[PDB]
Structure 1
Amino acid sequence: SNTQTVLPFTGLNTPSGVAVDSAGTVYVTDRGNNRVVKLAAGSNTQTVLPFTGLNTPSGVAVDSAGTVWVTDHGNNRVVKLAAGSNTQTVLPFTGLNTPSGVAVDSAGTVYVTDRGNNRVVKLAAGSNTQTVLPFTGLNTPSGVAVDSAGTVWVTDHGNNRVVKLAAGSNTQTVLPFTGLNTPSGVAVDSAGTVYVTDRGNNRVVKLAAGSNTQTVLPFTGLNTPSGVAVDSAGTVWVTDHGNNRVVKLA
C-alpha cells in the first residue's frame, strides 16, 4: 500500500509490544499506562484486558486458542490470560530479570527474552521447567519471534544486530541487516521474511525471504518504533512508541 493507517486506540502512552491473532484482533502493551489493550478488526472501541498489577508491560503474544501472554517487565514475571479467564496466571519461569519480549509457537511453547540476564528462555508446552537457549554474546536482548519451523529470532538490542537460532541447533546466525541502531522488535511471516523495528533510526526494515540486503518499509513520521507484528495477509503493525500510537501498513 505504501500508505500507513493509524489504529483507533485511545489514550495510549508509549505503547511497546504488539500481537495479532488469526481473526485480525490487535493486542498492544500500553507500557506507560501499565495495561494491555485490544482492538477487534473493524472495531472502533478498544477493550482493556483484565490483567492486574502490571509494571511496564513490554511484550505480548497470542496463540491459536486466544490465550494472551505478557512480559511484566517491572515485576520480573510472565503472565497469561486464557481466552475466557478473569484470573491471570504467572508462568513458572525462574530467575527472570527485566523480561522484555515473548513469542509463542504453534505447539504452545513460550519464548521470553530475559533481557537483564542477556539470555532467552523457553517453557515447552505442557512443561513446568524452563530451559535456556544457546545464544551467545547477547546484550540486553529485547524482541523475539519464532517461525513455523521453530527457528527463533532475537533482536540483540545492545549490540545493534539481529540473530537467529534454528531448532535444536548450536549455531547462531547473524542476519545481514545494515546500520541498525537499537533494534527492538522482530516478527517473521510464513514466507520467512523478517521485520525489525530500528528504534534509533525511526524506521522499520525487513529482510525478504531469500534476499541478501534489507528494505526500509514506507512508514511515515515514526518516532522510536518499538514493536512489530505481521498477519497472514502481510499487513504490518508497528507500535510507534514516541508518538503514542499504533500504525499499520497493508
Structure 2
Amino acid sequence: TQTVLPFTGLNTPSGVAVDSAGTVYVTDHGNNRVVKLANTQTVLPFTGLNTPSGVAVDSAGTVYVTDHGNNRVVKLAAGSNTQTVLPFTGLNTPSGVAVDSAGTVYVTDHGNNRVVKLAAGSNTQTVLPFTGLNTPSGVAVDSAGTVYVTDHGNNRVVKLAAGSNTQTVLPFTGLNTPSGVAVDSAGTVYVTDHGNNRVVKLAAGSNTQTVLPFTGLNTPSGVAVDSAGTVYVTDHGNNRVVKLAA
C-alpha cells in the first residue's frame, strides 16, 4: 500500500531524489525551489532558480538540480549556503540530471536532443554517442556505468553500454510519452509511464513488465529508488509525492 509523504505548499512538482540515509528531495517547479524531507519539509539554500526540473544527489550529499528556463545546472556541496554553477555550455533547456559513483554529472540536454556528461572538476563537456532521439527526458546511471535515458518523443527507453557505443531499446510495452527513469543495484530499471498515469519497472534480463501498485496518479514524472527498493515517484497533477515499499 502506497503512502503520501508529508509535503506542504508546493504547486506542480517536478523530479525526485533520495539520499543514502533515507531523506527525499523534490523540486518545487512553481516556487523555483528545491524542497527536501528528512520530520517537516525544508528547502536547500538555492539562489536564483527559475522553474527547476530534475534533481540528483551525490555520495557525499551534493544535490544536483537543473534549471529548465535558466539553462543552468546548480549544485550544493555540504552544509553551506554557497552555490556552484557547473561549467555546462550550449545547454539549451536541459531535462533531468544523474550522477555517477565517481562524481560525473549526467545532464539530458532536451532542446538539442542529446545527453551530455561532465566529469568532476572538468571544464569540457562530453556528448554521449546517442543517436535517433526526440525530446529526451530523464537520465539514470547504474554501477556499471550504463546510461539509461528516456527517449521520450518516441515512447522508448534507450540504453548505452559502458565501453562500447551500441544503443539498444529496452523491452517495454504500452509506453506512451514516458518520463522519468531510475535504476537500482540489481539492474531493475524503473520508468514512469507518464501517458498512462502509472509507474513501471523491468527486471534485468526479464521479459515480464510489472506495473507498480500506485493509486491516484495524475501525470507522474520523477522517479527514484533507495536502498531497500522503495520507489519514490512524483505526480505532477496532484501536487504530492508518493512512495511504495518493496
- Aligned equivalents of 2:30 and 2:133: distance in 1? 26
* Runs of 5+ consecutive residues of structure 1 not aligned to the other structure: none
- Aligned equivalents of 2:51 and 2:125: distance in 1? 23
Is the partner of 2:179 in helix, strand or coil?
Answer: strand
- Aligned equivalents of 2:46 and 2:120: distance in 1? 22
Shift of 1:6: 0.2
Shift of 1:52: 1.5
1:89-168 counterparts in 2 under 5 A? 89-168=84-163
TM-score, scaled to structure 2: 0.97
Shift of 1:186: 0.4
Query: Deviations 1:42-73 (Å, cap 9, x if unpaired)?
Result: x5311111112211100001011001110111
- Aligned equivalents of 1:33 and 1:158: distance in 2? 27
Query: Deviations 1:144-202 (Å, cap 9, x if unpaired)?
Result: 00000000000111111000101222100100111111111000000000001111110
Give yes or no for contact 1:152–1:165 (8 Å, CA) kept in 2.
yes
Give yes or no for contact 1:163–1:175 (8 Å, CA) kept in 2.
yes
Is the partner of 1:60 in helix, strand or coil?
Answer: strand
Give yes or no for contact 1:141–1:154 (8 Å, CA) kept in 2.
yes
Shift of 1:5: 0.4
Shift of 1:126: 2.7
Give yes or no for contact 1:176–1:213 (8 Å, CA) kept in 2.
no
- Aligned equivalents of 1:146 and 1:229: distance in 2? 12
Q: What is the percentage of aligned positions where both structures have the same residue?
A: 97
- Aligned equivalents of 1:75 and 1:221: distance in 2? 32
Q: Comparing 102-111 with 207-216, which one deviates more in the overlay?
A: 207-216
Give yes or no for contact 1:199–1:224 (8 Å, CA) kept in 2.
yes
Is the partner of 1:129 in helix, strand or coil?
Answer: coil
Structure 1 segments, 4+ long, off by >6 Å, are: none
- Aligned equivalents of 1:214 and 1:78: distance in 2? 34
Shift of 1:240: 1.1
Is the partner of 2:174 in helix, strand or coil?
Answer: coil
Query: Deviations 1:73-102 (Å, cap 9, x if unpaired)?
Result: 110111101112212111001000111100
- Paired residues, number: 245
- Aligned equivalents of 1:164 and 1:12: distance in 2? 33
Shift of 1:233: 0.3
- Aligned equivalents of 1:192 and 1:123: distance in 2? 23
- Aligned equivalents of 2:2 and 2:10: distance in 1? 18
Query: Deviations 1:109-145 (Å, cap 9, x if unpaired)?
Result: 0000000010000001231210000001111101000
2:77 maps to 1:67: no
Is the partner of 1:14 in helix, strand or coil?
Answer: coil
* Runs of 5+ consecutive residues of structure 2 not aligned to the other structure: none
The structure where helix makes up a greater share of residues is 1
Coordinate RMSD, CA, aligned: 0.9
- Aligned equivalents of 1:228 and 1:68: distance in 2? 16
Give yes or no for contact 1:144–1:186 (8 Å, CA) kept in 2.
yes
- Aligned equivalents of 2:181 and 2:162: distance in 1? 18
- Aligned equivalents of 1:50 and 1:218: distance in 2? 35
Give yes or no for contact 1:177–1:213 (8 Å, CA) kept in 2.
no
- Aligned equivalents of 2:46 and 2:20: distance in 1? 22
TM-score, scaled to structure 1: 0.96
